[PDB]
Amino acid sequence: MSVSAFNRRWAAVILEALTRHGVRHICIAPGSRSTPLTLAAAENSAFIHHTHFDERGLGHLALGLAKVSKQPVAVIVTSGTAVANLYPALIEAGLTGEKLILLTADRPPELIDCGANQAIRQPGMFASHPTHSISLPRPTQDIPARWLVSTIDHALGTLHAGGVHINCPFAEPLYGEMDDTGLSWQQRLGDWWQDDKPWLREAPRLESEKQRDWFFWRQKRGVVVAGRMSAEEGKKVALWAQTLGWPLIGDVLSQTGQPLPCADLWLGNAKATSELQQAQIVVQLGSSLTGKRLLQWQASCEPEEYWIVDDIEGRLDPAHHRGRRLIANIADWLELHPAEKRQPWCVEIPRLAEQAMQAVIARRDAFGEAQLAHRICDYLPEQGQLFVGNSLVVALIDALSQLPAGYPVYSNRGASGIDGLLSTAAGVQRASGKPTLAIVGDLSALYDLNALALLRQVSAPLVLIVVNNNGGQIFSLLPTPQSERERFYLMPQNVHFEHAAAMFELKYHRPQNWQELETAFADAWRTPTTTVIEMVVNDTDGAQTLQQLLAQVSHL
Amino acid sequence: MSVSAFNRRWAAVILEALTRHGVRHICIAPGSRSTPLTLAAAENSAFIHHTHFDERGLGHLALGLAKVSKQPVAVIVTSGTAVANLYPALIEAGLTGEKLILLTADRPPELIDCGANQAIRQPGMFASHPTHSISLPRPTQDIPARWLVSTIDHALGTLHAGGVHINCPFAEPLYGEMDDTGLSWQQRLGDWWQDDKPWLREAPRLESEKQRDWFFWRQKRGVVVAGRMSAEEGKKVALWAQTLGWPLIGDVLSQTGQPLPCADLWLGNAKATSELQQAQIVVQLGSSLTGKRLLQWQASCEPEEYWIVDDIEGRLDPAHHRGRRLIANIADWLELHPAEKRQPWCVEIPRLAEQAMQAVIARRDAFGEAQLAHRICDYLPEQGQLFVGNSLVVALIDALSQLPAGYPVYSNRGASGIDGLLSTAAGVQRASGKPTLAIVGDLSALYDLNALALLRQVSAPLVLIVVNNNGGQIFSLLPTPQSERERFYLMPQNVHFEHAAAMFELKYHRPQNWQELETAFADAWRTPTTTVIEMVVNDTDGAQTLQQLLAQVSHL
Amino acid sequence: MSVSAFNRRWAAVILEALTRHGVRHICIAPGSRSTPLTLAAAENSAFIHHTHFDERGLGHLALGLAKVSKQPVAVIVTSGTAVANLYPALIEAGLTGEKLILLTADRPPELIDCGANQAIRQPGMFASHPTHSISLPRPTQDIPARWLVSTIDHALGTLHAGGVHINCPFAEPLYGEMDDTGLSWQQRLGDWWQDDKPWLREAPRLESEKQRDWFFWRQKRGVVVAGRMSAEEGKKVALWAQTLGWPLIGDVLSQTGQPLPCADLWLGNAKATSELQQAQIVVQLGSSLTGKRLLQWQASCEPEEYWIVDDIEGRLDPAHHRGRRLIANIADWLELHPAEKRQPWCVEIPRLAEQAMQAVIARRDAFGEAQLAHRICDYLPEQGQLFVGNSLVVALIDALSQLPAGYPVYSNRGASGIDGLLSTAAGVQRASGKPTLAIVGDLSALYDLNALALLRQVSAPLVLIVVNNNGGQIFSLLPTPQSERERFYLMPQNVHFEHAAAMFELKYHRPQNWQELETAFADAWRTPTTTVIEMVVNDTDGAQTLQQLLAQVSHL
Numbered sequence A, B, C: 001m002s003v004s005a006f007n008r009r010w011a012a013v014i015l016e017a018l019t020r021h022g023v024r025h026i027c028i029a030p031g032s033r034s035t036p037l038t039l040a041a042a043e044n045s046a047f048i049h050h051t052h053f054d055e056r057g058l059g060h061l062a063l064g065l066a067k068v069s070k071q072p073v074a075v076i077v078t079s080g081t082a083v084a085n086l087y088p089a090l091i092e093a094g095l096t097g098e099k100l101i102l103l104t105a106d107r108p109p110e111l112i113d114c115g116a117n118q119a120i121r122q123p124g125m126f127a128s129h130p131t132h133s134i135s136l137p138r139p140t141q142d143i144p145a146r147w148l149v150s151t152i153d154h155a156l157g158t159l160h161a162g163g164v165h166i167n168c169p170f171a172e173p174l175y176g177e178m179d180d181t182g183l184s185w186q187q188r189l190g191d192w193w194q195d196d197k198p199w200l201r202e203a204p205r206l207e208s209e210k211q212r213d214w215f216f217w218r219q220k221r222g223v224v225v226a227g228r229m230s231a232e233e234g235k236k237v238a239l240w241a242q243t244l245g246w247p248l249i250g251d252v253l254s255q256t257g258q259p260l261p262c263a264d265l266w267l268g269n270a271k272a273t274s275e276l277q278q279a280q281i282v283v284q285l286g287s288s289l290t291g292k293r294l295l296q297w298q299a300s301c302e303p304e305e306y307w308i309v310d311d312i313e314g315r316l317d318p319a320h321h322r323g324r325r326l327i328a329n330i331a332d333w334l335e336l337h338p339a340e341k342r343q344p345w346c347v348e349i350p351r352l353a354e355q356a357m358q359a360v361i362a363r364r365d366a367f368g369e370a371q372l373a374h375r376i377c378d379y380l381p382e383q384g385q386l387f388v389g390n391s392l393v394v395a396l397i398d399a400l401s402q403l404p405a406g407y408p409v410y411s412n413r414g415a416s417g418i419d420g421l422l423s424t425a426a427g428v429q430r431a432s433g434k435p436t437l438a439i440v441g442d443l444s445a446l447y448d449l450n451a452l453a454l455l456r457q458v459s460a461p462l463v464l465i466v467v468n469n470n471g472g473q474i475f476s477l478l479p480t481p482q483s484e485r486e487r488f489y490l491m492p493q494n495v496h497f498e499h500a501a502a503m504f505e506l507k508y509h510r511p512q513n514w515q516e517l518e519t520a521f522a523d524a525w526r527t528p529t530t531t532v533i534e535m536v537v538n539d540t541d542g543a544q545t546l547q548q549l550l551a552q553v554s555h556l
């Protein structure tokens, strides 16, 4: 009657069940109460194990792994505030669809609400942000293993997207030699242990039907808006929009190649919006649109119908247009609603976008963050991936650069948090095995500073650009009041990142001009290690350059 | 600007939006805070309005209406315990899939938690039981009508099954002359007001893929179990199982024609269960299986695979078998997995089912509830429908009768409450316009006694049989302790229902023999009115007859 | 190792624990899953057991018992919608403070969300309305009895007011002979089984401190508003306000004797409100004020300070005055803040109130509901109690009658539901053993009609007056729209209650004049039984009479 042994048999059923749904990566933070889960995971040869000491960073690491691999990723944490630190990544996964399976160890019910150490009320603590929530009961042999495996199989099988909170209480003793307690209990599952399928297969698909009046609407004056999607989906959307003869507005997160680049500029020109007013239908594929001018135009346009195609559920139009919400894999939906060659109807916008790109190129020389964003395509690693941070970097790349079609971009643009970008980038890199360029701001790098520990383990060179503009200079772009701006918005920390890099034995460069930045990159791509490149720029130059380019393109 | 007028335009957008998703029936209870909703509904010509003073019965009325019409049915109640009385019907709909749209008037936020009369905390008060929960904000023109209609359209469009809780706060004044306040706000919706589709079309379908190994499994020794489903699905399932040569165990709710009747009896015979041990796959269509012996066999059986096909989501096997949970329209699923003619493999069970039926036929003469259940087909109205109550009646009919294939049966077998059976039957009748036979126990009739008011308005004859065995005699069938049984289980109320019928001006019969029962029926089918037939039987005769028949068939 | 016997030991600990906190009354509805609780209660000699088949009426019966006895009252229900039917009485308990302990049987965790019959998600289903919620775990001897009893003792000891939800899962088998399973487990509590105290005494008192500036505020022009309170508290508040010389506005629920009667009438006079504008402080004792003119004056008045003294927590002023919210026993609070002799400062209001009462007396002769309310003091049983229903009756009694000081008045005026007035009145009666006068409207009587079953067992004569004006004529009182009024507001049911009384074998009178009403009362007070007195009055006479008296008193 060993309680510790049965705890580990119970946990073993949980972990093995996860392996039947494609869970390969598991992220583990240290703890005692989580011993059954952690030991079950450590003995299971199906898993790739990642570890970290910061549970918030651990959640974001799993988020990067799931983001890139598109598979579900498991997380194990002990009870207490460890569980609470998983909330940010769980919320982001709830918005962008990553499947995070959170195995959160818990105290047994008899140690809740009685002043016990490290014991908190854990069931339901993530409210509505998980797609599925499971509060497992106190382990007992009187509950059959087929129930437990069926519960996990239901949770994973019906998971369209988002996280699953599985709260796992365990009573002490937690340690001891394994005996035969729970062995026959496990063996009631028969040769399921030697199988590769779930015990219960419940995998219904959620998908919109094909639109039968599509061959009617494809004949009208349409606009294609491309948001976040996969790289191949970006290429397919570009070819499809070109065949329809519809203008393609491509987000930085779309890998379209942006045939009409610098939309965040030329959408501010009245000639562009006036021409767009002729559109009778807008077909948007993907969501989480980046550029402000694009969100303003989306809010202002009044086509007869507005369609949003995406594999995310729920409403995705923040302007609440009359139209359609269509849940589908974008590539499959494009096969279901194919294009037919038709003459382009736009005449003024292509010239406007060409002139906008020219206006940016004329200002490429100064050694600032706006020029860095504009020139970032010259620095993308061959056969690599781009992880773009939040705040100004993603806005400037979206507004000022033309990224190549099908070159993968990853981001945390659900909630756009600055709290997990380094640990997320580590997961992005570890998932794909590709050389990675990640670009973040100074406050973002400080926020997840300890994630530099994770970046000591990458499988290919990862360049982390930290743009140091001494604060959150997006609040120099926003019309924040000047008298409170410094103390309450920008919050400069007056630091550099050479000692942070030295602390974790990472190569570091602080280039002062373009030649030295190119030298730094040429060095950094030579080894499967993380190199930190700090670009020190004058605080408000990027914001002001963006404003000036906006005005200049508006008078075209 | 007029607050009362704008409140009514806000409500009018809500109700009009509901009409774009098939909402036709609307159930209304009286109140003051619900005035914007109730007046908007009264002015909208798309609705059939039903009224009732008991909100618990009003919810069950909406439940029966939705049950029969297969469309979402709306409910309007004022704030306070009126909302709370909707909980039972909402729970049952959450289990069996009826789409109840609950429009619950509320006090505005400034009158919550301050001692205001009839003001309670309403958002989230139904916990996880609604499929969707919408807590509308305090009405204001600063929120566009397109947002409101889009929120409703998202909720109804993605509603696969179950209830939607829409909390609707309204601030006073509620009354006053209608002026043009909010007219422009409404007109931002354009010609949507003259349209017949939603403002936002968001209607993804949830369905399992085709099982690609079905051509293997169809040739193995299978068993077909038919649970609750529609009448036409019942006929298709019967034909499908017959073609496969698999034994069909048909529930009273399956309308399959029950080709192996009295399963609750012959499943107690060791030769049957021994023959079923040879089954390699069980394919169950529908759920909420009725009989105790059937649930025990399901719990004990160990096929290689156990499948449950149904249009309800989630796990439906209370024994957690290894197998599959397939979400589909059953007719579509049968076409997707067609049968191929193979010879039947069962030898002993058909004979056992015939002999069991004969054993019931031998005891048909006594004027008791077991005989009424066994003989109930002789009282089914032509082109009518059967509504069967809970406790002993559904068990005795399931065990003792063979109901004709395709003859519609309705019930409340999700949670199996005895709290709303009369009002549910009233909704069933009003939705179909068909002559109805409804059968309930005495405690069930007392529980929903005031629903006799609703049964003063039927569009076709409805016979209500109240089996009066003086208490809940299911607790004479279960091995309840003898010393506490009467006071704490049976709870006989020692009443008759003649004065209940007279209070609501309903025809009444208390037949003493079969001939007088026939006479009561013949009188009852002649006009579109409700006739109450009270059948007085000795308390434990039906339970004992069931026990004796179980033993006798077990010794065959 | 008997699961059934241990279920009953676990339950026996729960019920015995409740007896240490003053739980004497227990209300039990029938079921199978509730067997451990029901048998534990049936075997425990500390309890008085009440039974009922309608769980909503069972909740209101417990509500009335707790209302009168000021003890916590326990309720046992089976799993499923039975649990949901307790919601209205629980909400009312959350508003007015009755201590209801809801013991709700549940299926064990392995039968949740898997299609099992009568199994729903019960933990948290009452949202925020219980003061304390306990989700008991699956019973096991690995959890010590001292944990179980300590958790119950914590919930009951810290219960200031309101309901407690104790969810109690039990796995089958539920029946079987008691053996020694769980005996030593129970015996770990030692001689606590022979004790009269809780295992854990945790009973912190919640109370506001003495107001140090009260001797300052006693000398200002104050008004005393008396809301709902106990009978003794009403008498003390009357003497206190008289000693201060402050006008006492006394609610129908205050039992103050209403020295300025017909406040709902004379508060409509400009001289009264103009005089009251001189008030620099208002001290309200109790809450849930009844009358519309009183609520309007509270909303409009702007004293320097507004105090509400009550033993209920939270804000109790729906008008949000600047001031104090003082939590205390009213009698204790009067002793901490005693009155000093001061000269009344009001001159116009006493005369106005005498004139209003005279104006009502001038209209006492017609045989209508307004006149019944005005004259109701002539029918109060000696040493008895009054239970006043909702809608017009409580408003007409409040506006037109002067009830004697200290004569007990009971009501359901938290949420003011019409859904449990009969069963509540039965509990009010059984708790005190006093002769009871209960007055309700026709829709109220229909709503809780089956509670007439409960009224077959009263310990003293109870007169139930049903005022039948054929609908909810309070909506003839409010300015509802004329063409929708009857169908969507009044909803007349066109019934009488002679057959309802006859069905439950209750004496019935339908008096046609004051003499026959007198005779009916004399007949009713002779035996400890319920007599139903139906007063048929013309639909709008009571409402209209009130409006006329309001206009006339407003113009004095």
Ligand SMILES: Cc1ncc(C[n+]2c([C@@H](O)CCC(=O)O)sc(CCOP(=O)(O)OP(=O)(O)O)c2C)c(N)n1
Pocket: A030, A031, A032, A033, A034, A055, A078, A079, A080, A081, A082, A118
């Ligand atoms: C946010 C969160 N997440 C995880 C833990 C777990 N947890 C601990 C217990 O407090 C508890 C065990 C347990 O029950 O799991 S201690 C501990 C290690 C601390 O390492 P250190 O700073 O180098 O100090 P040292 O161990 O003395 O060398 C962890 C990692 C936690 N407490 N809080």
Ligand SMILES: Cc1ncc(C[n+]2c([C@@H](O)CCC(=O)O)sc(CCOP(=O)(O)OP(=O)(O)O)c2C)c(N)n1
Pocket: A390, A391, A392, A393, A416, A417, A418, A419, A440, A441, A442, A443, A444, A445, A469, A471, A472, A473, A474, A475
């Ligand atoms: C976890 C969390 N908490 C706070 C924020 C807010 N927030 C931002 C928007 O999101 C701002 C809109 C908004 O806040 O409504 S941006 C921003 C500054 C980032 O500074 P940086 O890295 O130095 O880069 P820079 O701006 O380019 O110079 C902050 C701090 C956040 N995103 N996530």
Ligand SMILES: Cc1ncc(C[n+]2c([C@@H](O)CCC(=O)O)sc(CCOP(=O)(O)OP(=O)(O)O)c2C)c(N)n1
Pocket: B390, B391, B392, B393, B416, B417, B418, B419, B440, B441, B442, B443, B444, B445, B469, B471, B472, B473, B474, B475, C030, C031, C032, C033, C034, C055, C078, C079, C080, C081, C082, C118
């Ligand atoms: C609203 C609610 N609350 C309680 C129950 C429980 N419950 C039953 C099971 O359904 C459940 C068992 C169980 O307790 O496990 S049956 C039953 C008695 C039925 O009395 P009847 O109408 O005269 O019919 P008869 O028994 O054939 O004579 C009760 C009272 C319920 N179902 N619904």
Ligand SMILES: Cc1ncc(C[n+]2c([C@@H](O)CCC(=O)O)sc(CCOP(=O)(O)OP(=O)(O)O)c2C)c(N)n1
Pocket: B030, B031, B032, B055, B078, B080, B081, B082, C389, C390, C391, C392, C393, C394, C416, C417, C418, C419, C440, C441, C442, C443, C444, C445, C469, C471, C472, C473, C474, C475
């Ligand atoms: C459970 C629930 N659901 C609905 C309501 C709404 N509601 C009322 C509240 O607005 C008034 C509460 C009060 O303040 O007294 S009053 C009322 C009509 C009652 O008709 P009646 O018994 O014939 O008496 P009469 O009006 O004097 O003729 C209704 C149907 C409710 N209170 N509770």
Ligand SMILES: [Mg+2]
Pocket: A441, A442, A443, A467, A468, A469, A470, A471, A472, A473
């Ligand atoms: Mg910065």
Ligand SMILES: [Mg+2]
Pocket: B441, B442, B443, B467, B468, B469, B470, B471, B472, B473
């Ligand atoms: Mg019965």
Ligand SMILES: [Mg+2]
Pocket: C441, C442, C443, C467, C468, C469, C470, C471, C472, C473
């Ligand atoms: Mg009335």
